[PDB]
Amino acid sequence: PLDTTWHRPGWTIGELEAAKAGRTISVVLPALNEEATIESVIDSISPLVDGLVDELIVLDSGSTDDTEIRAIASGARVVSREQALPEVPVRPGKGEALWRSLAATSGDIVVFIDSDLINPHPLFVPWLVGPLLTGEGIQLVKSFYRGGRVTELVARPLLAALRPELGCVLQPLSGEYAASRELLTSLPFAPGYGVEIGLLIDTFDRLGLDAIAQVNLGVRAHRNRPLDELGAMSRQVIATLLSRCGIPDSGVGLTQFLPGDYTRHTWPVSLVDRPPMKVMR
């Protein structure tokens, strides 16, 4: 489209390493109870360490399963939310984890990869960093791939309504993306599952489409979740999206009625972003 899109990447690893030119690369895997998938994800990236990748961490976000110990056994440095930034009490949600991870990394470039991926290609990271290394003015790279109910029913239609320029983004909510530290530390971080959409919209509003690229990763598999759980995610995405569009959110959580006779449950929603990590230094 009007967006820089690689529908098939082809840089070799040696070219990319050469292109670093003193710049460093950190990789962060946020993880909450992903014991089943975490090892395969770590193993897919660790051969790059001390070479193309200078740093790899798992940001453990309060797991109560064997996530941390399995990650350690895969040679990964595991960092709790508390260790990333101990002077600041921990809030729940993904955005907190990603924001904190900036304080636990040092790379000029930062790559995020979700830890719930089922057997990810070992070229995910090179493909994401390609445009940052060989491009001009690129500061953010989003992935896409080949059922994404929230993406196609919520985020993309809302983008069409309120930021149609971002209509060309195939996977705005993708947990796999890369960006410059300079950008990331200059942006606020939305709470919960709002974090990705916020970064995308803020980036666009600030630098326009020319600073954004997207790359095809092929076909990704993962643990599809419960509708009930995607309600809360959609709610936070909506809250975050409306905010960027200058629209006031009620702050009222989604309520759900579960049949058993029905019982009612209300999920939390947050209207508070974390500020740019820059202000913390």
Ligand X SMILES: O=c1ccn([C@@H]2O[C@H](COP(=O)(O)OP(=O)(O)O)[C@@H](O)[C@H]2O)c(=O)[nH]1
Span 228-267, contacts to a second copy by CB under 8 A: 228, 230-231, 234-235, 238-239, 242, 247, 249-250, 252-257, 259, 261-262
Any binding-site annotation on 70? Answer: no
Window of 112-120, 162-170, 210-218, 240-248 that interacts with ligand X by CB under 6 A:
112-120
32 binds ligand X (CB under 6 A): yes
Residue 103 corresponds to which tokens in the numbers above?
A: 């304080």
Any binding-site annotation on 229? Answer: no
137 binds a second copy (CB under 8 A): no
CB of 267 to ligand X, least distance (A): 13
97 binds ligand X (CB under 6 A): yes
Owner of token pair 């202000």: 279
Any binding-site annotation on 221? Answer: yes
Cβ neighbours, 10 Å, residue 14: 10
Considering CB under 6 A, how many residues would be counted as binding ligand X?
A: 13
Exactly one of 116, 196, 202, 273 binds ligand X (CB under 6 A); that residue is 116
Q: Which amino acid is present at 252?
A: V
CB of 272 to a second copy, least distance (A): 16
Considering CB under 8 A, how many residues would be counted as binding a second copy?
A: 41
Binding mask 137-176 for ligand X (x = CB under 6 A): --------------------------------------x-
147 binds a second copy (CB under 8 A): yes
What burial letters (b/e) apply to 173-199, b meaning 16+ CB within 10 Å?
A: bbbbbbbbbebbbbbbbbbbbbbbbbb
Q: Any idea what the Cα angle at residue 84 is, between residues 100 and 66, rounded to 5°?
A: 100
Q: For residues 239 and 270, what is the distance between their CA atoms, to the nearest angstrom?
A: 8
Of 98 and 238, CB closest to ligand X: 98
Taking the alpha carbons of 49, 175, 4, 186 in that order, is the dihedral positive or negative?
negative
Which of 202-210's residues contact partners 24+ apart within 8 Å by CB, and which partners? Answer: 202/244, 203/139, 203/140, 203/179, 204/163, 204/165, 204/166, 205/244, 207/139, 207/183, 209/2, 209/3, 209/165, 209/168, 210/4, 210/137
Of 16 and 269, CB closest to a second copy: 269
Phi and psi dihedrals of 162, rounded to 5? -120, -20
- Helix/strand/coil percentages in the chain, nearest 5: 40, 20, 40
Owner of token pair 């990869």: 113
Span 164-223, contacts to a second copy by CB under 8 A: 164, 167-168, 170
Any binding-site annotation on 34? Answer: yes
What region, left, alpha or beta, does residue 167 occupy, with left being phi > 0 and alpha being psi -120 to 50 degrees?
A: alpha
- Contacting residues toward a second copy, per CB under 8 A: 7, 146-150, 152-154, 156-158, 160-162, 164, 167-168, 170, 227-228, 230-231, 234-235, 238-239, 242, 247, 249-250, 252-257, 259, 261-262, 269
Specify binding-site residues.
Answer: 30-34, 61, 94, 114-116, 148-151, 193-196, 220-225
Residue ranges binding ligand X (CB under 6 A): 30-32, 34, 61, 92-94, 97, 114-116, 175
